[PDB]
Amino acid sequence: PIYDLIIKNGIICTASDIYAAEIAVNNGKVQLIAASIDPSLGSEVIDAEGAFITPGGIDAHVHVDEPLKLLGDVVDTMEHATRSAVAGGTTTVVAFSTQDVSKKGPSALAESVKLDVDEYSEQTLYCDYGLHLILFQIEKPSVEARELLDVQLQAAYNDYGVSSVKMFMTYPGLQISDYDIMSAMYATRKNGFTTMLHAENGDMVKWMIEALEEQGLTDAYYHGVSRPSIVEGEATNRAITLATTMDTPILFVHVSSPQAAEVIKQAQTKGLKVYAETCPQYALLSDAITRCGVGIDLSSISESPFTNPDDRFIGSKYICSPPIRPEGTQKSIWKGMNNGTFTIVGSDHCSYNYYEKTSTASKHRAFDPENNKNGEFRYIPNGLPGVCTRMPLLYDYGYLRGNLTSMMKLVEIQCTNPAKVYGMYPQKGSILPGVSDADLVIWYPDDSKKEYNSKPKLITNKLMEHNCDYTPFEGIEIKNWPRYTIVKGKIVYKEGEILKENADGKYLKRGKSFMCTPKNEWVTEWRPKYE
Amino acid sequence: PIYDLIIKNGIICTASDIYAAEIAVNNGKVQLIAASIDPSLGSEVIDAEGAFITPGGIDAHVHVDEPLKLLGDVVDTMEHATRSAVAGGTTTVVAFSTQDVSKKGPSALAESVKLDVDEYSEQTLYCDYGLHLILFQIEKPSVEARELLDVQLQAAYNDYGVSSVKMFMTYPGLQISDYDIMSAMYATRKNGFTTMLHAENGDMVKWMIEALEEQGLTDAYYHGVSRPSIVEGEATNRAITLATTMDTPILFVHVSSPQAAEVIKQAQTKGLKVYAETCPQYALLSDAITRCHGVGIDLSSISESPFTNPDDRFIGSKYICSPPIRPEGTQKSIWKGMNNGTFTIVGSDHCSYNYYEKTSTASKHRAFDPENNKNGEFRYIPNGLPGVCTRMPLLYDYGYLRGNLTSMMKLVEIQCTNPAKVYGMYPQKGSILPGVSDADLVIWYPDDSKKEYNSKPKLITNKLMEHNCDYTPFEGIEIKNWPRYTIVKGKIVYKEGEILKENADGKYLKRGKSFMCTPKNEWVTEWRPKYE
Amino acid sequence: VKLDVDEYSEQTLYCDYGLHLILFQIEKPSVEARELLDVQLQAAYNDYGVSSVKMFMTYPGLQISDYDIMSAMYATRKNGFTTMLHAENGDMVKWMIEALEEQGLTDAYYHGVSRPSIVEGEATNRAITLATTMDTPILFVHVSSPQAAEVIKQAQTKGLKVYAETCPQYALLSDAITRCHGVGIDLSSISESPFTNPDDRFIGSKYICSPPIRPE
Ligand SMILES: [Zn+2]
Ligand SMILES: [Zn+2]
Ligand SMILES: [Zn+2]
Ligand SMILES: [Zn+2]
Ligand SMILES: [Zn+2]
């Protein structure tokens, strides 16, 4: 035969089309779309049985255990995260490279990337992965700062194809001043890098945590209270102003505040290059889960404060940043996903155990009496596992339950826009013959009366195929799951089973995004020297 | 001879993708997309030479000469308009069926459509056409009338596949009350019809025209003055409020006011099903062209205008349309809306009247009729511009090449794919889907080439338009790309300046219900329609 | 005006009173009718010191077209009159009442349902647009809709001469008082209401006004 793989009787969904057609795959790539393909022409034939075929999901916000241990010890290696990704229909993940301050000179940031790539090259990878760079130490004064940083960015791009930079406006040790952000924007704009911001006002968070602790308000629920939506709103507004002054395209990660969505929308309406990412948990969960159809029925989730009232620390399972918001906020997230405010959807995947209390990668790391830590929300490692559930949750609660307008919108935000915004397009994100890596998901049929013993009814930890001991969505009904996950032409997941022999993931060098070229629009007559 | 046509070496553009690949066509349809296709497998092979291949354009706002003569006599028949469309890369047009008030009962609206279908059936059609229905007579009161109107829409859909209804909030004889619009929305929502509105406050326009004439301010330029953008803003806002109360998806046609774009954006942000169409002339022209003495067209480069011909005081009539072409500084807001999602689609509002013959019922000089107490006042000037041909090339050049649109993908989205989806022609039309798409395709000229193409036009001329009109508003302007091939249902109907009439085989198009026009199921109060 | 002044002149008056003029019949077309209407306002001012005119965008027999309002605004601006509008979309109200009655939804509570705040919002917006084109100061009477208050605030921020009046009942009462069982009054403390008298199905009529008392 001339093709490795033929997918028959399925319905292709892209970011702009839904139609019945067939796909031939060969040499790791999509080779052909036609009405019908002779099954004798392929080595293997998949009958999709009327089900949707989507491109593979691309999750550009995944945190894995890394050598510098910026987020302390995380339970998932790149092996575990990619295994979990694939079991949930995600076929490319992008994690984070931490700036190593012990390195200096022109190669300092390339060297930081090198630590991760070398660490993961020894692991079994189930799909491809790329890396963002995290920046938290910027040299001063500005004119030097912006100029040696330019040579460093070039080096990280040229050596390793890193084309995105992540910065924080919160967290002690990560938070940077506006002055430093401007210096970074100067460098990133010049190099066509994708600039990413975590926008929460760090000073406000800090002051409010101290005020709460002073009153002894330290339980998990007070994490949300310490940082209301207005704080994310202000920081996003400030970040947009900085972006505008610097004419730099900007992406906001894990947006969860209505105020932030408002200012983001205003900028987009003006035509400024402001992009945003949200996460399923911000659409599906409310802060009531932290103590005791549009959203998840919270009472159906198992092993939570509702089911286990005696366990006072179980709210830590749902502690993340920014926090899961109070009731009534979640509808504005779906609206933003539909109306164009959220360009992409990521998971903010960050895993810590709950059912073992002793390891450096536990939530119970918050209890360290000898280190003056007694379980206060401050000391709870922030994050939820979400890389596996991201796609199914959107399929079900988004498409099937009517909260997203169509499958085309689902594909756009989960697959195609992540590729475009992070320089993996067109290799990744669509179904383009002779161009696309054959990264594909075949779902189960929706209107069928046929029985599929392998199709899960509920989300369980075992289904996640990860290294964590819990999932926040444990016990909830899920109405579809990937039936096949195809990565670079090969079936790596089939009907509940991971096929390890077919794991062949590699580090991905990325290009410059075409979405992140500058508008060439300025507030004043000032222009950067290089213009 | 497995395939009728193979397009090689081209770059496929869709609403969501741009990539180099090749296309096989057979039996009027796209058959295959692959990296490379053996040229011996096709009867005819086209070498695209690195140029973009786009789906054919779909222009869902075209006015053709029709038997009831609602807009008086128009110069273009369906033959002429489809010929012109095809020369400009448009491969599907949707015109308008006028409600015939002489016909009564359940079949009254189907019978109105039948008048047009029968008339055009005798003409040579260069591409497919569909029809919208125009409604201006609604029976009163509301409840008592609901049974028949609903029954009438069903019959227009069942017999002829008409699934869109057009209404006016301005013009004497077309304007309808809010009460009647609600009655229509009740019927259209129930039938999943696409509901279209021309939103200008008719009472304000009427009052201000009378005020201007009373002062003797009657020249063509005062057409714009009679209806400033705030009038279009008010009516749009009112129509949104009606659609919200009625939970009815709504499309606004030819939008040109910033205030209208604003209220439209706010509704969309809220998640309401509000769609909008704009036209090239609102992005490219300003009202200075309506009298003498970078984002758009250099107005001084247009030939046969008030600038070039100051003596001819009536020449402003060439650029008179509804809503009017707006003052300088408005046009940026149009592009912005095209990029930021406010404008779902782009149409031409094609409506053709001669300027260089003064005698005929289809002239602009119809405004001069001393006997009928008409003396050239803007009031009496027939409204409209020819635009079906230049719509696609103008967007390609001024939109994509000149940077006013973000990408070729956005161009295809608004010009081709969204019009198909919103008017129930999807997936048959609007994209490049193997085994599914009618092979309606445009091959452009290459952009970065030093090669010379003697057939590629440098300027827009009237001859280039291949229409029945004696003028085009964009005469004399530089155009930086043009369709090199227009393929309609697998056949080359236009190649390098030439129309191939032997390959003309256009048909009336029955349309489905749009998937974008299902209701949100969101209400302002506890009230629900009886049928819910 | 003379009809009212003469009628009240015979009564005992405990304080002073003035009069607004209510307009519901405007001559058409606008240009032809101008000198008379301007001449008529002058006479009402000169003879009786009436300097304010009230118009309705709702109610059968009172509702007037936008065309007619512009005619009036032309005359009022020229004469420095205070121009007052009752802003509800009359066509929407009419259509929705007929819709509710066809379902048999006729109880006093459905008065509010027949005319939700978005109807007052639309009409106010339309009236402001008319005022703007006519450069005529405008006052909105008995405003009770958030949407109307929003568009009124935007106009004032722009510096347009848009004024507004509200009423205590719109601050103090919610439409739960219009049918049988905060910053306003404890509704359970009101006597002889649907709450105290559930048997009396018509007692909601005590709180029926226009625009209606709004939801909580
Ligand atoms: Zn973060
Ligand atoms: Zn993160
Ligand atoms: Zn129109
Ligand atoms: Zn039109
Ligand atoms: Zn009143």
Side-chain angles (χ1 to χ4, degrees), chain C residues 120-161:
Chain C
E120 199 188 310
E122 190 293 291
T124 308
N125 182 75
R126 182 167 24 121
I128 300 177
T129 309
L130 299 168
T132 300
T133 302
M134 299 313 293
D135 185 59
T136 307
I138 182 164
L139 190 134
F140 293 100
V141 296
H142 49 43
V143 186
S144 72
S145 150
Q147 294 89 178
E150 279 180 14
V151 293
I152 290 159
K153 170 67 83 188
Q154 299 173 48
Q156 293 164 342
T157 290
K158 275 189 215 150
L160 292 163
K161 299 284 238 301

Side-chain angles (χ1 to χ4, degrees), chain B residues 61 63 71 96 166-168 170-171 174 197-200 227 253-254 277 282 322-323 349:
Chain B
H61 202 133
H63 304 273
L71 318 176
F96 292 89
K166 164 78 177 293
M167 296 167 301
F168 294 77
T170 190
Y171 307 113
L174 284 158
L197 272 172
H198 181 126
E200 288 191 277
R227 51 222 286 171
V253 295
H254 42 52
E277 166 204 72
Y282 304 121
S322 278
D349 184 26

